[model samples]
Target: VMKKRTYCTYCPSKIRRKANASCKKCKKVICREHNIDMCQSCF
Candidate 1:
């Protein structure tokens, strides 16, 4: 019930992958490998 998640927010261009979690602080889409359950910027 939010914005579509089709890629990682911190990954480089062409390195897209399905987002695993949304940032708890800002609600931004992100992948699991970078931030556990939140975005790197938020942490």
Candidate 2:
């Protein structure tokens, strides 16, 4: 049961890294780099 990925989904654009965050706005997988309690890009 893995609906959420354990790694960062911000790849293809630091790519393929570890994810320890969940975007509050978009529910997208985020890494420590893009972690801000929400997906700022969508904000």
Candidate 3:
């Protein structure tokens, strides 16, 4: 299967990546580099 490219809500860095998980509260998709379970806003 293929994954779609996603971005980190915390950092708008040029590093393009894919979402590893979604925020438990906000339900926003977050990249592995930025999210460890929850999003920056939810954390």
Candidate 4:
């Protein structure tokens, strides 16, 4: 059986687009279209 990943903690308006590119800071399970490379909130 396959284990499931956690859902996006942010951007709850949409479901995860890219299964692999989920954002660590935003906690948003995002796709290439929505992922920002740098998480500025941490700065």
**Candidate that scores best on TM-score:** 1
Residue lDDT tens for model 3, 14-42: 65556677777876667777778687786
Model 2 lDDT per residue over 1-43, tens place: 5453666666433356767787766667777686655666777
**Tens-digit lDDT string for candidate 1 (1-43):** 5545556677654787677877879777778887777776775
Query: How well is each residue in 1-43 modelled by candidate 4, as lDDT tens digits?
Result: 3223443233343664434455566544544444454233533
Runs in model 4 lying further than 4 Å from the true structure: 1-19, 36-43
lDDT of each: 0.71, 0.65, 0.64, 0.43
TM-score of every prediction relative to native: 0.64, 0.53, 0.55, 0.31
Give me the runs in candidate 3 sitting further than 4 Å from their true place: 1-15
Residue 34, candidate 4: alpha-carbon lDDT: 44
How many backbone clashes are present in model 2?
0
Where does candidate 1 stray beyond 4 Å? 1-4
**Residue ranges of candidate 2 with Cα displaced over 4 Å:** 1-4, 12-15
Candidate 2 colliding pairs: none
Angstrom error at residue 40, model 4: 8.0
How big is the positional error of residue 16 in model 4, measured in Å on the Cα after superposition?
7.8
- Name the better of 3 and 4 by lDDT: 3
